[PDB]
Amino acid sequence: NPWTEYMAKYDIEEVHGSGIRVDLGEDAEVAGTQYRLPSGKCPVFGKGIIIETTFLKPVKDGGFAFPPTNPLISPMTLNGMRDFYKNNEYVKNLDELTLCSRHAGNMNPDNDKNSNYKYPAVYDYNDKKCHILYIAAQENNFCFRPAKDKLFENYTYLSKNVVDNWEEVCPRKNLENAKFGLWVDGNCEDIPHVNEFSANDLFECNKLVFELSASDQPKQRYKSHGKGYNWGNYNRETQKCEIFNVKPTCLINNSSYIATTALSHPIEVE
């Protein structure tokens, strides 16, 4: 298969390895008590939390983010973070997403003993700010739910395990004029079975895929480990979001299609 190396980033079960809609793929002990926490290795572009107050406010009059500190480590700009770690060569040059992830993982809630609990974070591309999330909960149907939304399009949900080479091994852009397929005997065949959801544009298709994707918590043993309906073939002409749950192994050239994933940005194409 000539597509092997290229299609590696779309093996979400392998490269991400956790829930996407709701990421709770690991556990960590804080002062004698185990807690669930995000552990996906890829960044989730466009993911935010809808409260039914925005969730990026510091922790009903508060949100999910870290409370004010001295000095202020949350929220912290990209330049603020690079200046903060200017003596650390292993950190200061990290990309904005990994750096935000490592910055959040630098704060230990257990001030008595070193623990494994590392807070998730959201990087806002709009004002280049890293928000450390004090609340790792993602759905409770004080009710809230995870979603991709126009308001969240510049948000990026980051677990503690976001790899520093996500640009190389994780999805971001949607593939224009391309259709996910399965490589069989020297040819890229169509996904034999897909679940068709109607969608007005690419954004709504990406939104639908996210809603159906790998989740580590049932809506309304729980770990998905990356398994789920993570991919979608969007036919822009028929306005169909063709959603499936098996990894694609090749691409098909088709001008009517845009290949998207639950991890991918809801707008960007290449």
Binding site: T69, N70, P71, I73, Y85, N88, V91, G105, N106, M107, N108, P109, D110, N111, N114
Partner: peptide
Amino acid sequence: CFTARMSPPQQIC
């Protein structure tokens, strides 16, 4: 209050 894991370790409250 939190504790920085990386050097220098310090307490941020």
